[PDB]
Design a protein around this ligand. Structure first.
Ligand SMILES: [Ca+2]
Ligand SMILES: [Ca+2]
Length: 220
């Protein structure tokens, strides 16, 4: 109710992707497709929270994976991530109210833009890391000048959105400590535990939900 008043006052909503908009972690799914799920999956857990320098953790994880372009294509085509229940309807209600919706991820644009298309979110509204490939398709690194490539990158994205569009009320929605750490500069943060409860987030967030339906505030 009071959460509904908050949610309805936003003119922009930024969603974390991994474990919020989708059930999975995009990089762990890619690691599965490339055959090193075990090591990378725990490296990803080890980075969760404000725990390690993100950029180093991403280099090491990708150095084990070595994803080729055709492997990224196969992931998107054959093992696409699962949208969290309710998120399709939630983004639809937001877009019908002219709230600008963004996706922000430390994952990868190829995957996140696939997710955005399913949600009618334009690619201009997607902020993620960009994989590089050689002419033959072999993994060649990633763009380190992206804000999402560095620790604190979600906060840097939101700051860039404020400067570009002058939004008066930007809300960050996400499951982890780095999402909670994006407020400020976000105006409010709503923790999400529908896929996995991070107790550290749930204990310290003013707003926390476990089911995307809870923000649907008028049953239509
Ligand atoms: Ca997340
Ligand atoms: Ca911050």
């Amino acid at each position: 109710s009071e959460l509904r008043k908050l949610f309805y006052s936003a003119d922009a909503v930024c969603f974390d992707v991994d474990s919020t908009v989708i059930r999975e972690e995009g990089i762990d799914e890619l690691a599965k497709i490339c055959g090193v799920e075990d090591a990378v999956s725990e490296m990803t857990r080890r980075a969760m929270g404000g725990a390690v320098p993100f950029k180093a953790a991403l280099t090491e994880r990708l150095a084990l994976i070595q994803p080729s372009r055709e492997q990224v294509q196969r992931l998107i085509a054959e093992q696409p991530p699962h949208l969290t229940p309710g998120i399709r309807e939630l983004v639809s209600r937001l877009q019908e109210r002219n709230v600008q919706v963004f996706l922000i991820s430390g994952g990868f644009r190829s995957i996140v833009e696939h997710v955005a298309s399913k949600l009618n979110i334009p690619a201009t509204n997607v902020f993620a890391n960009r994989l590089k490939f050689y002419f033959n398709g072999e993994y060649a690194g990633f763009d380190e000048t992206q804000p999402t490539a560095e620790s604190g990158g979600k906060g840097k994205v939101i700051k860039l959105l404020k400067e570009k569009f002058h939004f008066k009320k930007i809300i960050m929605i996400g499951d982890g400590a780095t999402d909670m750490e994006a407020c400020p500069p976000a105006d409010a943060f709503i923790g999400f535990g529908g896929n996995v409860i991070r107790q550290q987030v749930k204990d310290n967030a003013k707003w926390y939900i476990t089911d995307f339906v809870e923000l649907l505030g008028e049953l239509e």
